[PDB]
Design a protein around this motif. Structure first.
Motif, PDB file in Angstrom:
ATOM      1  N   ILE C 322       0.811  -1.128  -0.119  1.00  0.00           N
ATOM      2  CA  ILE C 322       0.119   0.052  -0.059  1.00  0.00           C
ATOM      3  C   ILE C 322       0.790   1.310   0.070  1.00  0.00           C
ATOM      4  O   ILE C 322       1.757   1.520   0.901  1.00  0.00           O
ATOM      5  N   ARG C 323       0.723   1.979  -1.063  1.00  0.00           N
ATOM      6  CA  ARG C 323       1.664   3.092  -1.028  1.00  0.00           C
ATOM      7  C   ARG C 323       0.991   4.253  -0.113  1.00  0.00           C
ATOM      8  O   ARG C 323       1.817   4.768   0.627  1.00  0.00           O
ATOM      9  N   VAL C 324      -0.354   4.546   0.114  1.00  0.00           N
ATOM     10  CA  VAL C 324      -0.596   5.487   1.038  1.00  0.00           C
ATOM     11  C   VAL C 324      -1.877   4.920   2.001  1.00  0.00           C
ATOM     12  O   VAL C 324      -2.884   4.331   1.504  1.00  0.00           O
ATOM     13  N   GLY C 325      -1.874   5.000   3.307  1.00  0.00           N
ATOM     14  CA  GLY C 325      -2.464   4.623   4.254  1.00  0.00           C
ATOM     15  C   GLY C 325      -3.480   6.023   4.893  1.00  0.00           C
ATOM     16  O   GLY C 325      -2.549   6.879   5.378  1.00  0.00           O
ATOM     17  N   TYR C 326      -4.622   6.151   5.212  1.00  0.00           N
ATOM     18  CA  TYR C 326      -5.187   7.044   5.352  1.00  0.00           C
ATOM     19  C   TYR C 326      -5.324   7.285   7.061  1.00  0.00           C
ATOM     20  O   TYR C 326      -5.753   6.312   7.562  1.00  0.00           O
ATOM     21  N   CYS C 327      -4.670   8.299   7.566  1.00  0.00           N
ATOM     22  CA  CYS C 327      -4.745   8.702   9.039  1.00  0.00           C
ATOM     23  C   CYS C 327      -6.124   9.285   9.303  1.00  0.00           C
ATOM     24  O   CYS C 327      -6.188  10.267   9.757  1.00  0.00           O
ATOM     25  N   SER C 328      -7.064   8.359   9.308  1.00  0.00           N
ATOM     26  CA  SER C 328      -8.414   8.852   9.621  1.00  0.00           C
ATOM     27  C   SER C 328      -8.956   8.780  11.216  1.00  0.00           C
ATOM     28  O   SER C 328      -9.946   9.399  11.644  1.00  0.00           O
ATOM     29  N   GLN C 329      -8.054   8.060  11.897  1.00  0.00           N
ATOM     30  CA  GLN C 329      -8.227   8.036  13.393  1.00  0.00           C
ATOM     31  C   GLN C 329      -8.301   9.394  14.351  1.00  0.00           C
ATOM     32  O   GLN C 329      -9.225   9.103  14.915  1.00  0.00           O
ATOM     33  N   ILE C 330      -7.401  10.314  13.815  1.00  0.00           N
ATOM     34  CA  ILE C 330      -7.577  11.465  14.383  1.00  0.00           C
ATOM     35  C   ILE C 330      -8.934  12.267  14.526  1.00  0.00           C
ATOM     36  O   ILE C 330      -9.353  12.319  13.150  1.00  0.00           O
TER      37      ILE C 330
END
Lengths: 688, 254, 638
Positions: C322-330
């Motif tokens: 995976i090139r990009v993982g979304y930091c949606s946790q914040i």
């Protein structure tokens, strides 16, 4: 000499002049409002200015003829036939939603309430306009919407929902009271907007204990408060009516005026460690200080419930005078009700639904999936798995009954305004981290402290706490009532910094009084009271008790008894750990000064000597051998014996020792050797 | 000045571990002293449950994570010599087991363990800061007091406060074939409750056998065997007083 | 071990301080131990405000005064080096104000805070004698009691005894640019509250920079600098264990603002939990994005941010695949200031009532057929139409097509009526009257929430067309109808509609009333009247419906009359009887305030209970239907 140096312990009983107001009769409730402080008391209403407690205006609720046919607020003075009963206020509230009014709620007069109105220019003049709430229920005369408060015991809480003044009231009911005139265990009253009555919005709005369990299963309510769109109650009821052992309980229901739809009881207990306290004396809801926030895991802004749980006489409600205080972060309790206990723990609610009913047999609990949605088939529930807490003081109060509590914050600490059964009013810097000693422990009055306490904190630096004891209302500045009472340096340093004072070489004292400039609050010298004994032989390394205080290194709470050492001349006497306390030392080593070194300061005591023993003269010289004659010796912790047998010591002195000679089956004389822990110089021979 | 805590450490050589998933390295001449830095309390700002030494680079690196974690890569870097701590991989109880770090979160009666961080339902869990180096992790049950009953934990179930996790002793899966030298096992427990001496090191008691000169007789870690076929297994002791002692192993059948 | 407070000192080069009007000099090797002694309590009786050492001298001379002390002559002497006590000179708050020791003597109103040794003009000046150890300065304001408010200085002003002082935090004052290397500042703390060591020092880290070797970069004392061109300036740590750390400076946190673009984050973890590699490191698949990222964002680290301003903050997962993982946790700061739906991407799927949202696409088809406002997510309660009341959702059930998902957001003294009236709706609860209501359409009435004690419909019964509250007066126009369904208003509305089991015949005897325009705003002093079925303050009321006239007043006028007891909100109206006390009370709830605007008469409000009953020379308060008229329309489309 632990007893003698007990003067180190703080003077528990010192007398204070604080604004003290006295009443003619006992005071039950008190309310603070707009720079006046009203009091309800037996047969009387008193309004008093704060800073002086001058009884500015007095309105007397007269004792009132109780005659069976005389209606409550019609005037039956003309009646000559039937008893001059008296009233005791049990509910005093202030409303300002409608207009600035006070509401009083009497005992004897069928428990019907009345409202006093504040004129605009002058607020103290309550006696001017008084109106008695009362509405002849023509529609259904069978039930009382206006017969509000019972006699045996009640709690009343006012609120404004939906532009609606609602009184949530709980009553204690004796079986006898009902058929004459009904009441209810918990009920929700709308005040009629025209301020001339109350209405029951629905038969659902109330819950009454079924007709059969009136005389048994009495519930007395102890506190009532609001939070987070919920109206909790705190009461004490037996877990099982047959068991007859009372235990603390909590009540939850959302504030919908239509009635109490989400009604949930939970058992609350506080244990020590597994000794469990089943009774609660008083409670106070407050926000916690920064320190305690993490320490119980609550956020700084969350509500917190403080309760003084007490052990109770077994199979009875009477407190045993063993107490605790325990903190219940309201988020924890709400989570416990919704999901922590599963359906298996839940049951139907005995006293209302009944021991056997269709509801008790089976019902789904939309407990997690729904919060308070008004249900026509509302379910009465009773949990069984008590919410267990642990003590905050770790049982330091295990023997003394607590009766009233309040809490404010200060800096980051949080303080408790504890009150005991015999009228001592402590203040404790509460933390689970360290057993902390009260910084105020004066005796207030002979009578027990009432649980009703009014505390106001202004601008965070000037506040006060009205407390009620017997017939006395007193103003205590929370800012630290004093620190003169401290006399032990460790205590001076343990007193929380919000009271500015520190040790100056002889006594804990405010900073700007003692001139020596030795006034310090971080490091101080230890003090020695006495030494026993001070007569030591050259070879005698003998047990020396050292009486003093501040013998331990002073760190936050824990005392480092390890940063201690004793210097005698040049050598160091032998210091033994298990018998060395910040109270006392027990060491075992030409007048000489002993020096005692601690992690902070070193003290010099000149009361020591290396005395060289002398023995010179013995009586008798020549005699028989019967072994019962007395011996007199003289010269300058010892023992004396001859022929392997110790003579009984008739007398002791430095310069005159008397012993009864032991019996020896021999007819000659012996040099007698002193054994003062050591065989020092023997004396000469005496003819047996 | 140093302690051979390697008697506690676990050895696998000619191997290396890397976790490129976003580490402290200190120069010492001996893996023993690097283990000593790891063992020293407060000395290590990070909690190293492993470390590798290479005599060649004169450098030592210390991992706050064992191979048991995810994200670790195992490779044949021959110069590197791994060092684990068998205490975590133990999954066994040694007496009181005060130093039990294993990852068991279930009790005898099968109710989950409360996290030591969460005060609900039990508020006597203020220990995560009370006792540094308790290794008391998120949920797994330990013996922070070294209390005798065994590793206990608080249950999520509100009624019961604490219940002791049952955890089988290492001996229970260990048997000994009558000779014992055939048995190639996992115990390190003598009869006198002492841990063996390291074979490869010769300190402090100096013994004749070295694993390199006698390979395939498994003188690895400190594993009580029969180097010369004694009835029941034995080793030299770390203890300066006793030269050598047996190890007590039960027998198996079938 | 020993002591180390030299770090808390400043320094300057090649200057010696000569106090012309006045202290000991000791051959001590370490100027650092010298400064430690000066900081150490009881080291010096006098007040060691600074120190100076000359290594040519190797004689240790503490100075109990500042260069800001009057009359002291600096002298450019190479061999001499000064070391100032940064507490007094910095004059900026750092952490607690409990021990303020900074040289600021200015009131909030810009007056010189008096010398605290000055009894003039104000009495309480014996403060240094009263409290010692508090650094109760000569004239500079210092907290004497650790007061919450802080340093409060007895102003020299005659009128005011004391006025307070406000000291800004040093961290807010200090700022750096996107490069940051050009920034020069007195900030000396890392991002974890750690302190930078003295650049000149070689302990505990013997790093590469020798400030003399690499001058011109401001390597002085512990000041944070960007020597290696990081997005943030950073320093080697005073703690030996920590190699070095970044320094927290603002430009010249967790909770998300916007799409996280300007936002910056210290968390590289995602929703799959995979930690993310640094923009500095091309690991793993050697993405060309990492070099581009250095230009894309001038604030960066091993942590995860939004250099491209994507919708969910992105990083490079250590996972090579995976090139990009979304930091949606914040989390993102649960709605405020956006009453418009599109501004709020609501991540929730449950309505007010308790029913879950349905598959959005069929609803988009039906709505585009129906609603004509002008691609939003499948089945999430974000409202598309940017409605006034905010986010709302669709429900499958026919009786309730759609409802809001619950989120935070930002007659007495009257006249009888001589004639039959149609708007009046007599609500009947267990066969007696409880409230009046307004007739809107042929099957729809408008009433107030307060009037529905029970939610049940098996009991409610509506009558229309009546002149007597019991009907004894007339029955020809009495229309008896069951009640079909209840619909509650928005949250905080206190407003409700109820729809009938069957329609009604409309004739002269029974009439409906129109509704206001969306913003229809009443002229002030407009006359209009209420119709009431209430008690009327009458010993006997025969049962005629009773009318009371009224005049609209501004919200301000009612604030005056109510003396601040009303906190007026947008949705309310306030109309008050003039010079007479007459108003609706019990029984009038749900009653209509109808105001003739221009040629016809129209409804504007609902009678609802509040602040007292019929109080003379006090206005009345109602809910303005205009704020809800659109909602009435959308619901009436059901």
């Amino acid at each position: 000499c632990k007893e003698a140096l007990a003067k180190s312990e703080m003077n528990v009983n010192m007398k204070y002049q604080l604004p003290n107001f006295t009443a003619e009769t006992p005071i039950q409730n008190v309310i603070l409002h707009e720079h006046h402080i009203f009091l309800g008391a037996t047969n009387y209403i008193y309004v008093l200015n704060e800073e002086d407690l001058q009884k500015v205006a007095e309105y007397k609720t007269g004792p009132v003829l109780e005659h069976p046919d005389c209606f409550p607020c019609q005037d039956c003075s003309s009646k000559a036939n039937g008893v001059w009963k008296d009233n005791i206020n049990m509910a005093l509230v202030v409303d300002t939603y409608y207009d600035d009014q006070l509401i009083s709620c009497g005992s004897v007069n069928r428990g019907t309430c009345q409202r006093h109105v504040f004129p605009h220019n002058h607020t103290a003049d309550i006696q001017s306009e008084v109106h008695c709430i009362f509405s002849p229920q023509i529609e259904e005369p069978s039930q009382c919407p206006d017969c509000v408060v019972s006699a045996l015991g009640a709690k009343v809480l006012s609120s404004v929902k939906d532009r609606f003044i609602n009184f949530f009231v709980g009553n204690t009911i004796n079986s006898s009271y009902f058929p004459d005139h009904p009441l209810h265990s918990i009920s929700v009253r709308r005040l009629k907007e025209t301020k001339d009555g109350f209405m029951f919005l629905t038969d659902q709005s109330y819950i009454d204990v079924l007709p059969e369990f009136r005389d048994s299963y009495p519930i007395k309510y102890v506190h009532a408060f609001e939070s987070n769109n919920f109206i909790y109650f705190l009461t004490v009821q037996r877990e099982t009516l047959d068991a007859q052992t009372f235990h603390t309980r909590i009540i939850r229901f959302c504030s919908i005026n239509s009635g109490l739809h989400s009604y949930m009881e939970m058992p609350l207990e506080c244990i020590l460690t597994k000794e469990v306290f089943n009774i609660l004396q008083a409670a106070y809801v407050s926000k916690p200080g920064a320190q305690l926030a993490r320490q119980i895991g609550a956020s700084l802004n969350d509500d917190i419930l403080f309760g003084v749980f007490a052990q109770s006489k077994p199979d009875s409600a009477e407190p045993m005078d063993r107490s605790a205080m325990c903190a219940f972060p309201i988020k924890y309790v709400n989570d416990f009700f919704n999901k922590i206990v599963n359906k298996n723990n839940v049951r139907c609610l005995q006293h209302f639904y009944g021991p056997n009913h269709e509801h008790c047999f089976n019902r789904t609990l939309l407990r997690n999936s729904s919060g308070c949605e008004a249900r026509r088939d509302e379910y009465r529930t009773e949990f069984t798995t008590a919410l267990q807490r642990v003590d905050l003081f770790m049982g330091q109060f295990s023997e003394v009954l607590l009766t009233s509590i309040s809490t404010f914050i200060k800096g980051d600490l949080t303080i408790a305004n504890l009150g005991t059964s015999e009228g001592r009013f402590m203040q404790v810097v509460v933390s689970r981290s360290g057993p902390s000693t009260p910084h105020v422990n004066f005796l207030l009055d002979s009578h027990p402290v009432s649980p009703e306490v009014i505390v106001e904190h202004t601008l965070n630096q000037n506040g006060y706490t009205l407390v009620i004891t017997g017939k006395k209302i007193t103003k205590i500045p929370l800012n630290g009532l004093g620190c003169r009472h401290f006399q032990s340096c460790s205590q001076c340093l343990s007193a929380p910094p919000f009271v500015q004072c520190g040790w100056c070489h002889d006594k804990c004292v405010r900073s700007e009084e003692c001139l020596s400039g030795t006034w310090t609050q971080q490091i101080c010298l230890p003090a020695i009271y006495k030494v026993f004994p001070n007569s030591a032989p050259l070879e005698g390394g003998t047990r020396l008790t050292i009486c003093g205080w501040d013998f331990g290194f002073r760190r936050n709470n824990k005392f480092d008894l390890k940063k201690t050492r004793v210097l005698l001349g040049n050598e160091s006497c032998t210091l033994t750990l298990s018998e060395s306390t910040m109270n006392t030392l027990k060491c075992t080593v030409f007048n000489m000064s002993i020096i005692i070194s601690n992690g902070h300061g070193t003290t010099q005591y000149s009361t020591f000597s290396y005395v060289d023993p002398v023995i010179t003269s013995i009586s008798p010289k020549y005699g028989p051998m019967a072994g019962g004659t007395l011996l007199t010796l003289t010269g300058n912790s010892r023992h004396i014996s001859i022929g392997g047998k110790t003579c009984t010591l008739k007398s002791v002195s430095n310069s005159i020792l008397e012993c009864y000679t032991p019996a020896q089956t021999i007819s000659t004389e012996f040099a007698v050797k002193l054994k003062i822990d050591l065989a020092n110089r023997e004396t000469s021979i005496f003819s047996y | 000045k140093r302690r051979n805590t390697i008697h506690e450490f676990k050895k696998s050589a000619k191997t290396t571990l890397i976790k490129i998933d976003p580490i402290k390295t200190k120069k010492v001449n001996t893996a023993d002293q690097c283990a000593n830095r790891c063992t020293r309390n407060k000395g290590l700002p990070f909690t190293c449950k492993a470390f590798v030494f290479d005599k060649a680079r004169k450098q030592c690196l210390w991992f706050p994570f064992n191979s048991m974690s995810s994200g670790v890569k195992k490779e044949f870097g021959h110069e590197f010599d791994l060092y684990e701590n068998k205490d975590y991989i133990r999954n066994c109880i040694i007496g009181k087991g005060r130093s039990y770090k294993g990852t068991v979160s279930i009790t005898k009666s099968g109710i989950k363990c409360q996290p030591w961080s969460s005060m609900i339902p039990h508020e006597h869990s203020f220990l995560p800061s009370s006792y540094r180096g308790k290794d008391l992790q998120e949920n797994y049950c330990r013996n922070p007091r070294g209390e005798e009953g065994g590793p206990w934990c608080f249950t999520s179930n509100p009624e019961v406060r604490y219940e002791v996790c049952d955890i089988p002793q290492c001996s229970e899966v260990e048997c000994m074939t009558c000779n014992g030298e055939s048995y190639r096992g996992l115990m390190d427990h003598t009869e006198s409750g002492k841990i063996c001496q390291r074979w490869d090191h010769q300190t402090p008691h100096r013994h004749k056998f070295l694993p390199e000169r006698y390979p395939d007789k498994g003188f690895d870690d400190n594993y009580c065997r029969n180097p010369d076929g004694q009835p029941r297994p034995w080793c030299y002791t770390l203890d300066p007083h006793t030269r050598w002692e047996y190890c007590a192993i039960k027998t198996c059948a079938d």
